[PDB]
Amino acid sequence: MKRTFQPSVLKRNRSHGFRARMATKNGRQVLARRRAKGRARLTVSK
Amino acid sequence: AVVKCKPTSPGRRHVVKVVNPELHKGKPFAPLLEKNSKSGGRNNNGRITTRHIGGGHKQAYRIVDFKRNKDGIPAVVERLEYDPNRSANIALVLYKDGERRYILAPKGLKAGDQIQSGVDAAIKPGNTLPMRNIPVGSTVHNVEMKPGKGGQLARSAGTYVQIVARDGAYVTLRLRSGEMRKVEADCRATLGEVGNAEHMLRVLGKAGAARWRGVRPTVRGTAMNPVDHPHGGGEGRNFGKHPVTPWGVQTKGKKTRSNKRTDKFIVRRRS
Amino acid sequence: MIREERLLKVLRAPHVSEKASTAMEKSNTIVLKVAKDATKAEIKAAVQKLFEVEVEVVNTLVVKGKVRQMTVRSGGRVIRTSGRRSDWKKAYVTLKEGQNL
RNA sequence: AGGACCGAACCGACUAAUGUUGAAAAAUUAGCGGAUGACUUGUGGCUGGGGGUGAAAGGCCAAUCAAACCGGGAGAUAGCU
RNA sequence: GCUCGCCGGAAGACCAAGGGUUCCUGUCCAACGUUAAUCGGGGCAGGGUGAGUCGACCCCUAAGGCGAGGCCGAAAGGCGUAGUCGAUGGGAAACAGGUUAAUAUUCCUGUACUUGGUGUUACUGCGAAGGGGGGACGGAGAAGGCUAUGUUGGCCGGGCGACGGUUGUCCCGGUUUAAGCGUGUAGGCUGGUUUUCCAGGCAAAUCCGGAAAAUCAAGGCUGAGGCGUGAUGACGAGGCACUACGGUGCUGAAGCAACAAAUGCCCUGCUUCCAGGAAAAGCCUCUAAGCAUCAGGUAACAUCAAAUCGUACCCCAAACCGACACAGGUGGUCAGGUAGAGAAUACCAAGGCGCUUGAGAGAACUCGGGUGAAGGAACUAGGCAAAAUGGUGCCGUAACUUCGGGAGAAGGCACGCUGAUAUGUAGGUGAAGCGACUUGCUCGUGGAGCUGAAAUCAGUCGAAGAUACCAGCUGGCUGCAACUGUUUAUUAAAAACACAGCACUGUGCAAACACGAAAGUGGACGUAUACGGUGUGACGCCUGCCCGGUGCCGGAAGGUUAAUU
Incomplete structure (x- = not known):
């Protein structure tokens, strides 16, 4: 059966990547929270 | 001419088609074409704003002269062409100075005629x-x-x-x-x-013939649940209410024109 | 033209392997480790100057590093660590007729 | 010619059996329907929660849907256990 | 290592996506592996990915995104113009052999090709964010010409049989060879060439478009394949040597023809239909401003430059998505033989596997199957399940019907092998020879050779000849829905939804309506033969009476009636 995760690097980066987070102020607020928590990986960007 | 197809299969039994021998068979005039991408009835917000639109055949837009500004220069009719963007068909006219245009074909027009x-x-x-x-x-x-x-x-x-x-x-x-x-x-x-007054006599014949004109199926309001339409549910077939649009406005009689800017130009309203 | 300091930077080490030895003894080809950002023109100039040989052509590839795992002890306690070795660039330098080291 | 016919790929899911701490959080085996079309499929894109989308079943919206998920108001309130 | 078995339109081979060293070599067996393990996709160490031509990047744009100014909006922000991004699409060029334990169109050998820069020479009108061509486009169907590929013959090399026979209508194997360059033919399209003129191509043009005149239609574009060369080269059965028996080294015959051939190529063609089938750049061409013995353009030659990133390996799977070394899911490409209509099916090739617990036993019972006397639906809610039918050709086929259907209705019969007609027929292909011509990738005639159904007559074996696999059960009466379709991913596929058709109703375009505090956008680059809403649901015959109630439409005399005053 087809499962929900159907990976694609281009779609991954376009949806949750660093430049996508930086494009809006809500996404920029996501990054600030993750910096405050001290996350080792800020985004899915790799 | 309107032609009835023989009932060699269901879906052909009730098809009546309007055939026009004098319509051009080749490709249209390339300099007068543009692309016309379909919308699906969605606006720039991406939401369906007109229902029952989507699919159908790919179409190219032909720039039709609706202004008819070239005064005093005669034009001759080269050929009648099929236009998929309208019910009428169009005529390719050549002006005496060597410029071509598309116009709506009037009733009696045919190749060789002179217009001005x-x-x-x-x-x-x-x-x-x-x-x-x-x-x-x-x-x-x-x-x-x-x-x-x-x-x-x-x-x-x-x-x-x-x-x-x-x-x-x-x-x-x-x-x-x-x-x-x-x-x-x-x-x-x-x-x-x-021209093309026989347009109203065609019979589509099957559901698919409307699907490839870009029309999607219409679901009756009374077939839905109350959350979806004012014609709500019921155990079996119940109506018990005045007919309304999906947004609750009384259809079947209620007038909706409200334009005081224009009312001065209407001598009499239709009846 | 490439400055001499750049040339003294771009060459890292000869690369030793049986593929490298076979290449040298078959095709007069020299295999080196080079700076990861060294272009083929830079490698050509560097070999031609620092090794005093005449170079035919340079072929390059990037080698991805592997994950290496080993332990470090930090205050009377051994902890397992993991990390990736750094990438490096490998040059296949074909010599016209000279002899190298 | 055909929303034409029989029938593989391909797309479905009518019946039975098995399975039910499964090989599998919906499958397998034997049959079954469509198979040039209102078809099917890859790759991108758009629509966001009282909102979307729906050939309409309260269907689907990441194994979650008569109002998703995450965090917060928040130690809601609980004449009940 | 030898046998046996399984897949073979896959369980083989090559990728994309995704993964990320799983790849190859050496070592180890704690843990991991549903057992053991000397083995491993496990641990440790070392190695491995070579590009002007493949891909990315790059030039160009689709849907869409972002968007200087701008227009809107309490703020946040929304929309959008110029523009700029965005492939799943268009833009330059390499093939064949050899090689590593692990890479190859990348390394080597041989033979090529493309684009750009810079010089020299010769001849010269060059020059755009501008004009025009082109790129550039659907579905279906039908040839015809070919090729990949296959079969047989010839040729070459080998063989003479563990058991009767086997010096021959005998057996086994091989009979390969590319890009490029030259030629330009089966086919497809189109009249050509000059001269003059101009209300068109936002300006101007010698280009495109248009109008006349003359003169030849005998011209040009496009195009598979074949042929030549590439290639006295490479490869090549097999021998001859060494050996660590892994494997390495040397040499090397023939290397042709006929027939059959695609779903591949000609073909982005041709014919036909309606539902009427991207864009932009590269490319060709025309001029403007401008430049003027410059600069630029064309051609030849020379020379240089073609960077950077990917390249291992899996890839219908033990490397991806499913918590697993999970009977599931996953797009593209290739496709050999014998039967066969076939990519079904059976058995095989190349290739790959026996599915990571075994050994015995031969109870009940469960599961998956085979066969059953007599009976034959008596079973059961119900013929559920099973059994049965099943191919091709021919004969024959009712009611009813919207005249198409019903219909493979039903029901029958003939099917193997051998010989003859005919030492292989009808048909297909077609060589030499010969005749012409406009003189070779020519035409006509001819019929060698090859291939080759179907039928009839005669005979013959078996219980049985569509012998296996494969492969319709049929008929009668009725309810519902006209029909193909769609749906409750995961207990409901239906009589439910949709549907073509019908009706009512709204809407005069800045349309109604919908999404939006708005700007705007969809409706629609449409315009009443159009668009939205509602109900009904092919077709046929039809659709009666009621306006008291509730709505909607019209009217406004009168009563009542807000802010305000």
């Missing part, structure tokens, strides 16, 4: 004149609403407009709806009716 526009053009089908220069009682089409804007009225397949009166700066027209309307006498019109 302007104040001094002869009173013949396919000729475009200001309505100041057209005799009262004439049958015209592709009628301008504002001088120089381009034809807006009576553009469909079998439609036409009657000039019923001329009173000063305005002429009074009888529209296909039966409405009497005033327009400026400087607005242009083309003499004759639009």
Whole structure:
């Protein structure tokens, strides 16, 4: 059966990547929270 | 000519098609084409704003001359062409200076005919004149609403407009709806009716024939649940309510026109 | 033209392997480790100057490093650590007729 | 010619049996329907929660849907256990 | 290592996506592996990915995104113009052999090709964010010409049989060879060439478009394949040597023809239909401003430059998505033989596997199957399940019907092998020879050779000849829905939804309506033969009476009636 995760690097980066987070102020607020928590990986960007 | 197909399968039993031998068979005139991407009835917000639109055949837009501005230069009709963007078909006309254009094909037009526009053009089908220069009682089409804007009225397949009166700066027209309307006498019109009057006689025959005109299925309101439509549920087939649109406005009789800016131009409303 | 300091930077080490030895003894080809950002023109100039040989052509590839795992003790306690070795660039330098080291 | 016919790929899911701490959080085996079309499929894109989308079943919206998920108001309130 | 078995339109081979060293070599067996393990996709160490031509990047744009100014909006922000991004699409060029334990169109050998820069020479009108061509486009169907590929013959090399026979209508194997360059033919399209003129191509043009005149239609574009060369080269059965028996080294015959051939190529063609089938750049061409013995353009030659990133390996799977070394899911490409209509099916090739617990036993019972006397639906809610039918050709086929259907209705019969007609027929292909011509990738005639159904007559074996696999059960009466379709991913596929058709109703375009505090956008680059809403649901015959109630439409005299005053 087809499962929900159907990976694609281009779609991954376009949806949750660093430049996508930086494009809006809500996404920029996501990054600030993750910096405050001290996350080792800020985004899915790799 | 309208032709009935033989019932060699269901889906062909009730198909009636309008066949036109004089329509061009080759490709259209390339310089007068543009792309026309489909919308699905979605606006720039991405939401369905008109229901039952989507799919259908790919179409290219043909730039049709609705203004008819080239005054005093005769044009000859090269060929009649099929146009997928409208019910009427169009004519490719060659002006004496070597420029080509598309116009709506009037009723009697055919290849070789001569057309002209302007104040001094002869009173013949396919000729475009200001309505100041057209005799009262004439049958015209592709009628301008504002001088120089381009034809807006009576553009469909079998439609036409009657000039019923001329009173000063305005002429009074009888529209296909039966409405009497005033327009400026400087607005242009083309003499004759639009051709392809057999358009209304075609029968699609099957569901798919409407799907490839880009029409999606219509679900009856009474077939839904109350959350989806005012014609809500019921155990079995219940209605018990006044008919309304999906947004709760009483259809089947309630008038919806509200335009005080324009009311001065409506001599009589349709009936 | 490439400055001499750049040339003294771009060459890292000869690369020793049986593929490298076979290449040298078959095709007169020299295999080196080079700076990861060294272009073929830079490698050509560097070999031609620092090794005093005449170079035919340079072929390059990037080698991705592997994950290496080993332990470090931090205050009377051994902890397992993991990390990736750094990438490096490998040059296949074909010599016209000279002899190298 | 055909929303034509029989029938593989391909797309479905009518019946039975098995399975039910499964090989599998919906499958397998034997049959079954469509199979040039209102078909099917890859790759991108758009629509966001009282909102979307729906050939309409309260269907689907990441194994979650008569109002998703995450965080917060928040130690809601609980004449009940 | 030898046998046996399984897949073979896959369980083989090559990728994309995704993964990320799983790849190859050496070592180890704790843990991991549903057992053991000397083995491993496990631990440790070392190695491995070579590009002007493949891909990315790059030039160009689709849907869409972002968007200087701008227009809107309490703020946040929304929309959008110029523009700029965005492939799943268009833009330049390499093939064949050899080689590593692990890479190859990348390394080597041989033979090529493309684009650009810079010089020299010769001849010269060059020059755009501008004009025009082109790129550039659907579905279906039908040839015809070919090729990949296959079969047989010839040729070459080998063989003479563990058991009767086997010096021959005998057996086994091989009979390969590319890009490029030259030629330009089966086919497809189109009249050509000059001269003059101009209300068109936002300006101007010698280009495109248009109008006349003359003169020849005998011209040009496009195009598979074949042929030549590439290639006295490479490869090549097999021998001859060494050996660590892994494997390495040397040499090397023939290397042709006929027939059959695609779903591949000609073909982005041709014919036909309606539902009427991207864009932009590269490319060709025309001029403007401008430049003027410059600069630029064309051609030849020379020379240089073609960077950077990917390249291992899996890839219908033990490397991806499913928590697992999970009977599931996953797009593209290739496709050999014998039967066969076939990519079904059976058995095989190349290739790959026996599915990571075994050994015995031969109870009940469960599961998956085979066969059953007599009976034959008596079973059961119900013929559920099973059994049965099943191919091709021919004969024959009712009611009813919207005249198409019903219909493979039903029901029958003939099917193997051998010989003859005919040492292989009808048909297909077609060589030499010969005749012409405009003189070779020519035409006509001819019929060698090859291939080759179907039928009839005669005979013959078996219980049985569509012998296996494969492969319709049929008929009668009725309810519902006209029909193909769609749906409750995961207990409901239906009589439900949709549907073509019908009706009512709204809407005059800045349309109604919908999404939006708005700007705007969809409706629609449409315009009443159009668009939205509602109900009904092919077709046929039809659709009666009621306006008291509730709605909607019209009217406004009168009564009542808000802010305000």
